[model samples]
Target chain A: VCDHRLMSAAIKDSKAVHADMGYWIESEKNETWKLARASFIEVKTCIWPKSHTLWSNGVLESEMIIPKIYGGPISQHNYRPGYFTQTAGPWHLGKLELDFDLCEGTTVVVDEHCGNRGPSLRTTTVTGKTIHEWCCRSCTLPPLRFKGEDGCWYGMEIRPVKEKEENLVKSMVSA
Target chain B: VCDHRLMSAAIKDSKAVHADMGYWIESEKNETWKLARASFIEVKTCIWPKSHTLWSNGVLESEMIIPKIYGGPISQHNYRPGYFTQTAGPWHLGKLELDFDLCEGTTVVVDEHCGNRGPSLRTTTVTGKTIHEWCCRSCTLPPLRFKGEDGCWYGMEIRPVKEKEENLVKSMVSA
Candidate 1:
């Protein structure tokens, strides 16, 4: 069962955590470019929203069902034990080309597993999915303000993914 | 007539240019985060492409028709005298939640003149326009690899916007 209360706290706690990295930008004179990679533990799910609403933007809330073995960030672990869900809303849909509200019931397969491209959500039902991919061309996903049913917004800070841990989940899920 | 040869040179020259700025990120420990605001001269236009093609992603080439008095980066000044055009292609559409290819005839109104939100492309066509806006939530647009008619790909680097120059163009166009 996913504990909504703990999930809320975890979001608040993880907001304090932020990370960055450095890369080389080559030119006539090459320079080291600092890149801010991680900040929050944003969930990338294909799971459908239980309900949604619209304002200037939109919000999605759903009961995310998954396996106990699925492990990623420590902060998100606090969301375990039941069908805990929150609103992955406040999407700046006004700026986006297509209607994300139509993303309802559309199953997206996010490969939490890492690869050369790091991690990415797999192709889903949305025909216009390619634009979102290009925008988030970075290594990881951005943190979303996950809203708890208790009226609290949580920021799940991003953390480095452990390949070894992912392997364990793969094995467990396969079994 | 727009000289393709000079436009090619301008793109190459601007490639050497880059810029950055500082922003504050509030936290328990508030810190300054360096933001890379500009690098190359990128154009945002609602003007339709003369033609387009698709590959791994897509390419848009159009004879950008604008006023000669409208000044931007000095590197781009060489593209004068005719209807100069290039390919704003290489969009990573695979990861996007939508298809940019459908942006064929979609006209976009990009206000090069700065305002409170800086400058942005106004709404033209395409229902999915909001998505692109969200992706480029920054003040200005990013550089597009402008491919010249002479088989050259140029990077018109970005530079700070001169309000004085923009004022002249506005007055000139209005008159």
Candidate 2:
């Protein structure tokens, strides 16, 4: 979170840059001149407002879910258990199988273990049925979803991206 | 006649003033912190592209048609003898009057007159006309004619009234 002190300091720095690099004029005799690029230090503090509980709750939930997926049982080991004991479970074993399936789908064969259930197989058939339904619905889909084939999510990261730095440079040089 | 050299010098001086006075940004820490007023300088240069004879002919013809009703002939020394004499005579006094009027109007009135004619005339008739048109058309009337009770050739200098200047100063200091 950015305090007023930090913000004031940042503004002072930006004003100095504006005074130095921004104010310039060229005459006919001195036609071609280059100005040092103006640098702006963006101090983006991710401040979670006190009135908003969502961010705090989101972080806590993510911490809990990520560990649970790795087989850290909520009953035996609390959130901050010994690291050694935390990994000594069927969770890591199950991850390997999932990793193998993911690799096969991308490179070699069609993923046959669509709904393959593991040790905590409370509803194995139901899981298998759900996987089959997803695969049939999106057989030709690109590698989008990690679990599915469509690459919509992957393509999102590669979209033509422009940064503020390039935009600022262009604005400075434009006639 | 102002030559090209004078015009070029004026342009350079204007550019220098823009660079020097226009770039300063007032700081808030100053004991007399005043909002920095944006500076601007406007320049107008009259260019005569026509042959000197054509230019002078137009000047003479316009002067003959529009006689100066106020601020009598600037100088009588330039008056020629015989037909050019001011006293009523057998010679075509109309022709001599025409010549004198053109010489005085073009040389003294147009060239030597220091103050602006536009705002001076508008100050008189501005009560009846819209402010915008008063500024535009009032200055354009032929040489000596102006819409005013005095009906005399007089130059006007229009500025913010004293009250306006006081208000502006107050606002700047407060800001």
Give lDDT per model, in order: 0.19, 0.18
lDDT of 2 by residue, A73-149 (tens): 12111111111121211221221111112222122112444422111211112223211122211122222121122
Could you report the DockQ of all the candidates, in the order they appear? 0.01, 0.01
Candidate 1 is scored at a TM of 0.15
Error of 2 at A73 (Å): 52
The ten-residue window of minimal lDDT in model 2 chain B covers B9-18
Superposed model 1: Cα runs more than 4 Å off: A1-35, A45-175, B1-59, B63-175
Model 2, position B31: C-alpha lDDT score: 27
Tens digits of lDDT, candidate 1, B79-130: 2222233222211111111011112222222244423222222122233322
lDDT of 2 at B33: 17
Cα-based lDDT at residue B15, candidate 2: 16
Q: What interface RMSD does candidate 1 have?
A: 22.1
TM-score of chain A of 1: 0.15
